[PDB]
A = this chain, B = another copy of it.
Amino acid sequence: RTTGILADGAIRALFAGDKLKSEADLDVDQVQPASLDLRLGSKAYRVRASFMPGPGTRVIDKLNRFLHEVDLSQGAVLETGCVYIVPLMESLALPADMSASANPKSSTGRLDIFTRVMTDNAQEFDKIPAGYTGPLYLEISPRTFPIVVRRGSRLSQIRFRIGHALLNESEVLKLHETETLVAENPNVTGIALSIDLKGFGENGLIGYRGKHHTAVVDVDKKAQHDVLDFWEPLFARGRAELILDPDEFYILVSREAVHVPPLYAAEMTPFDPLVGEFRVHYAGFFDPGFGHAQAGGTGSRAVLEVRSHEVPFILEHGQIVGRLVYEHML
């Protein structure tokens, strides 16, 4: 292939040939099979609002039109509702033929943290254009939990590519035949992900609702917080359904156990038809090898962050909430 998603060797090939740069030496686990994690610098700027730089504008110029600097050396709490712009440790000198896109880490999404990667001259967030040279910034806004971040915190990741090597309806059905994509007949349209509101285990746990009032989650020290201090576990108590209320954040799971085979990457996409009623937020990248060589058998369920938009909505078990779009690795 002349087109597809750069693997991690090909990413390490960019740091060497100075198409990617960084303030410090990369972390050992910072390059991922099909993406790079982006790291926070030492300063955050508290702003009044989010903004688009626009054509002919450096972020740093716009940022000076606007406000209060926070030091992230030791670690600062970013509060819910507030907006911060953070220069990232990584910057780009991409080949004319190579472009990039950004998405939050699944752990960032789990914590309901709003993030946008902004680029110089940007007219849309999270899209790096072909042949981009310059700095990267992260806009950050905690929505449910206040968080502590610092220099080197990793909230976001970037996927590089030459062209768009997407798979079509028979290419996906073929791939499913040889390498299992759903553990079982896949709804090809990439693959449709539906919601499981039936439950799991002896108690029948459906997922979790984030608590509106909590203490601060350290983003680099996550295995050290207790669940019921941050979450309301949801259970089956009747018909297979959940009312999604507008102020609330839900962590739920797909019915499907999905598998992204070794030479492919994937990306979670919203279900456009129903984006008006409810959205899967924080839909991110899937690495080659997701659900691959595991204790249960092929495939693992996708963790999904759901919110209703304006009005309460009765989510029903089996509802199509999205689709995993598959893509060829270079």
Contacts and interface: CB of A to CB of B under 8 A. Distances in A.
Interface residues of A, number: 56
A215 B48 contact: yes
Interface in A60-89: 65-68, 70, 75, 77, 79-83
Contact of A123 (B77, B80, B216, B273): B273
A221 interface: no
- A interface SS class: loop
Contacts of A82: 79, 146
Interface in A111-158: 114, 116, 123-125, 139, 141, 143, 146, 148
Given A213-B245, A245-B212, A114 B311 contact: yes
Given A125-B277, A148-B68, A312 B52 contact: no
Contacts of A275: 275
Contact of A50 (B141, B214, B247, B314): B314
Contacts of A49: 213, 243-245, 311-314
A276 interface: yes
A108 interface: no
Interface of A: 46, 48-52, 54, 65-68, 70, 75, 77, 79-83, 114, 116, 123-125, 139, 141, 143, 146, 148, 212-216, 228, 237, 239, 243-245, 247-248, 273-277, 308, 310-314, 316, 318-319
